Structures are given as C-alpha cells and as structure tokens.
C-alpha cells in the first residue's frame, strides 16, 4: 500500500484518484490519499471549483519514487513532486496518518475495474507519449494536443501517440491498394504490431491509456486515438484470436466505466457500428456488443 500526501489544499477542488473522486473545500485540512494499491499505474486528477474547464492530472507508479502534491499559487494549480529523502518522506506520511487527515483509496475487494482498465498500461510507455524526462510522473490535461493534431503547435506539450492513418503510404502497399484499404490486416499485423508496437500488449496499453485520457480529461485527441486503434483491429480480417478475446474484455470495461451522460462526445457512432455490425469482427465482441446495446441503444 502506498501513500500520496498533500502539503495543503488552499483552493476548492474536486480531486480524482483513478475512478474515484472527492470534493475538497478551500483551506480544508486535507493531507492526501493512502492505501493506494502498488502494482498498477495510477492517476490523480483535478478540477478547480472555480474553473470547471481544464481538468488536469498526473500519471504515476508508486514503485518509481515517493510522490506528493503541493499547490503553486504563481501557476495556480496542484503540482506533483518527488521527495528524494526517504526518511523525511516516511516522516511526513507517518505523522499525517497519525493525525488521520488522509482519505483511503476506496477499493472494494470484488472490484477488478481499475485493473481491467489498466492491465496493459506501463509507466515507461506513458513517459514516451508524454515526454518530460526530468519527472517520473506524467502531466496531462484537457487542452493538450496530439502529434497527429499538430500536423493537420508547441511540441513540449504534445501527446506523442502512435500515428495511424488509413489513407497513407504506411498503411497501403503499392499494388495492393484496394486489398489493403478494405482489409487492414497488413497494416495492423506487420506495420503496427510487428513493426512499431512489437507486441499486442504495448498496442493495448496505448489504446487503454488513450481511453482514460479522453474519459478523465475530455482530451479530444485521445478519444480520436482510441477510436483509431479500435477501428484498425475491427477492419482487419485476420486478427490473432487472443487479441480478439482481450479486446472484447478491454472495451467492455471501458464502456462499463464511462459516465452515462458523456456518451455523445466520447463515442464515435461510425466506428462503433462498423466494429459491432459491419466489420470483419462484428461477431467477435459479444460482451462489448451486449453492453453497448443495453446501455446505449440510441447511439446505434
């Protein structure tokens, strides 16, 4: 079990930790979050009471250092920071628990949700998409653009997702134009899986990371990337059977976890009907198809 203390909470904010969240009042005595499960990535995120715009947050892994949160009044936001002094850190943590000023990461033991959303997400891969290698954690917010969005402006703040483009030389082998555009198996399996991602688990991790960034920050470019990755698989006639079974679980828990009221911007009508009903893989996402029909029948 790991802890993330907070120096203070000067301004009214809704704090999130993975899929949980709490309201915290201006200068209420709040000093952090305890009992966080070691072994998965996490994300602590924020929404100021004054600016319902701009959700922002930090991805992190407790095995990679001792992290805490401190409000910066020049920059006006809660910042993640690392304490290199082991003793000094256990000292602050121990005393704050003693004073019992910490909320508990509220995991129900039956619940595998957070594991199911993050199964394939690895902190080393996040730090290649959010490049800022003086820090062991990664900052993301609502307005950050992707690299592909920058092509069609400051690269320091870019989401360096893997670029997928169905109408590109990368995707289409000369002489197999028609074949490669209706059946993207070449693109998925040789170019993307064997070429760039090396294995299905990195692919799925980026897919999963992309979904959470869209869900937790309304990052529009992250939604776009999640749907592109889904589209690529469903539009491939030849997919490893284990990938098809994993994708059905992955999507199932993502649909399950989505806020009901956000279904209109977060779900691309075209991709889902194609995945579920038109594509090669229409019959291979039985769990995802059933949850979608019973929860969002209108979108289809």
């Amino acid at each position: 079990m790991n802890t993330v203390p907070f120096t203070s909470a000067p301004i009214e904010v809704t704090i999130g930790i993975d899929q949980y969240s709490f309201n915290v009042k201006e200068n209420q005595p709040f000093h952090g979050i305890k009992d966080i499960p070691i072994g998965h990535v996490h994300v602590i995120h924020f929404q100021h009471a004054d600016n319902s715009s701009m959700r922002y947050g930090y991805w992190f892994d407790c095995r990679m250092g001792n992290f805490y949160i401190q409000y910066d009044p020049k920059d006006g936001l809660y910042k993640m920071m690392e304490e290199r002094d082991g003793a000094k850190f256990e000292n602050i943590v121990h005393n704050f628990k003693e004073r019992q000023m910490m909320v508990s990461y509220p995991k129900i033991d039956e619940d595998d949700t957070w594991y199911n959303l993050t199964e394939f997400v690895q902190m080393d891969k996040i730090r290649k998409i959010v490049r800022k290698d003086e820090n062991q954690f990664s900052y993301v917010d609502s307005s950050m653009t992707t690299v592909q969005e920058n092509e069609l402006s400051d690269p320091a703040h870019s989401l360096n997702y893997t670029v997928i483009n169905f109408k590109s030389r990368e995707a289409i082998r000369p002489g197999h134009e028609m074949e490669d555009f209706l059946d993207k198996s070449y693109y998925l399996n040789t170019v993307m899986l064997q070429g760039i991602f090396k294995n299905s688990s990195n692919y799925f991790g980026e897919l999963q990371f992309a979904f959470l960034n869209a869900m937790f920050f309304g990052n529009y470019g992250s939604s776009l990337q999640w749907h592109a990755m889904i589209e690529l698989i469903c539009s491939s006639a030849t997919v490893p059977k284990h990938m098809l079974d994993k994708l059905d679980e992955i999507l199932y828990y993502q649909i399950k976890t989505l806020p009901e009221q956000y279904s209109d911007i977060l779900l691309n009508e075209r991709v889902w009907n194609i995945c579920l009903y038109s594509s090669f893989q229409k019959n291979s996402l039985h769990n995802t198809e059933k949850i979608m029909e019973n929860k969002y029948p209108e979108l289809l």
Binding site: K167, S168, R169, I172, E177, M178, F181
Partner: protein, 237 residues
C-alpha cells in the same frame, strides 16, 4: 471542397483539372437463365475522364475480361477506375498532370485518394452538380469504339470538336452538358434533333455535326424545349 453552382467558373481558369465519370465503367445486361434465375452479362465499358477547359477526353475502354473471376464487381469497378486514372496521371508529363480531379460520384473519393497517394499535391474533389456524363454512350462514335474493342485500350478525343475555335470554354461546356442532358432524358428525340437534316454531316475526326453558328442556336433551343417538355411529362406539371 465540393463543386457546386457557386464555384462553377473555377473549371475554366488555367489550373489543369479533370472530371472523372465512372457510371459506364461496369455495364451489364440482365437476362433469365434456363432454370429461370436471373443472371448478369457484362459488356464493354469506359472511364470518362475530361478536361473541361480544353475538351480533351481520355476515354479508357474497360474490356469485359477485367471482370473475369472477380467478386463484388460494382465495388471493384470503383477501384479499377482509380487504378486507371492514376496510371493516366502518371503517364502524363509533370506539367500536364492535373492540380485537381473532380469525381462525379462520391463513392470514388476513397478509391482515387488511395490510388493517388503518390500525388499528395493533387486534390480529389466531390461535386454537388448533377452532371450528365452518364449519357456519353449515347454519342454514337464513343459507343462504337467501346463496343468494338477486343482488349483494354485508351482512345483520345476532343469532345468539343472544333468549337473552341469560335467560342469560349464556358460556352463549350454549357453546350456539351446541354446536349448530354437532352440525350439522357430522351435519347430518341435528342438524336432526331441532331440528325434530322442529312445535309449537315459529322467530320470523320468529329463527334457532333458541323453546325454553323446560327444552326447551333436553333439546336440549343430545340434541346432546351425537349428538356422542359420531358420535365412536365415526368412530374405532371
């Protein structure tokens, strides 16, 4: 973006552009088999590729052999059209390559776009206009050379004959579409009108008769009248 009545005159500026019409690429007859089922028999088709500024027509004949042993033919037709359009572009010297290609049907955007990936600076565009290029097989000499072909072949024409020697592109194109529109709505009558007078002939190197200026005016009026008659008939107006 899309071509419509607003941006009509772009066609006649000095940027090279082509129309591509694919409605005659895949042509079938429908008949009954001995057991009484329905079957298709394909006939020769054509890609209708046209520079509306200069009249140059690139008529790419599509021989039935192309379809042999293939499925989802109507879908393949779109992809063969783009394959053939792409090859035409690539055969042409750089300074003759079009800057835009306008498809008369939106289904051709994605196949052409893919086939033209090697030409990122050529824009593939839809159109909102309702152009009558489907009626190209109602021009006797084009249908003759399509139907006689024994192999894939490209045949070049100028669809304006020698009109540009006396009129502007805008006018030439309006005349072409008026004549094709008439052909499409009532071929028998449109062809009657063009040919009634046996003393106005078609030059061997031409598609249409050698009308004088005055006679084109009578003809365009007769074509107009034909088109409005058929409209009233279609809708009881």
């Amino acid at each position: 973006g899309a071509m419509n009545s607003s941006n009509y005159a772009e066609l006649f500026n000095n940027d090279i552009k082509l129309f591509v019409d694919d409605t005659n690429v895949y042509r079938v007859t429908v008949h009954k088999t001995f057991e009484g089922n329905v079957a298709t028999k394909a006939i020769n088709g054509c890609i209708f590729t046209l520079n509306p500024k200069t009249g140059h027509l690139f008529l790419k004949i599509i021989h039935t052999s192309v379809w042999a042993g293939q499925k989802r033919l109507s879908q393949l037709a779109k992809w063969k059209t783009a394959e053939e359009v792409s090859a035409l572009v690539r055969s042409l010297p750089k300074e003759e390559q079009p800057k835009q290609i306008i498809v008369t049907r939106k289904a051709m955007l994605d196949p052409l776009e893919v086939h033209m990936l090697d030409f990122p600076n050529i824009a593939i565009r839809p159109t909102e206009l309702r152009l009558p290029f489907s009626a190209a097989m109602s021009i006797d000499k084009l249908s003759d050379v399509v139907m006689k072909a024994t192999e894939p072949q490209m045949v070049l024409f100028n669809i304006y004959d020698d009109w540009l020697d006396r009129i502007s592109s805008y006018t030439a194109f309006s005349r072409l579409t008026l004549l094709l529109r008439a052909l499409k709505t009532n071929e028998e009558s449109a062809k009657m009108i063009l040919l009634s007078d046996p003393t106005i002939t078609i030059k061997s190197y031409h598609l249409w008769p050698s009308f004088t200026d005055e006679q084109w005016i009578t003809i365009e009026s007769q074509m107009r009248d034909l088109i409005l008659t058929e409209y009233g008939r279609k809708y009881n107006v």
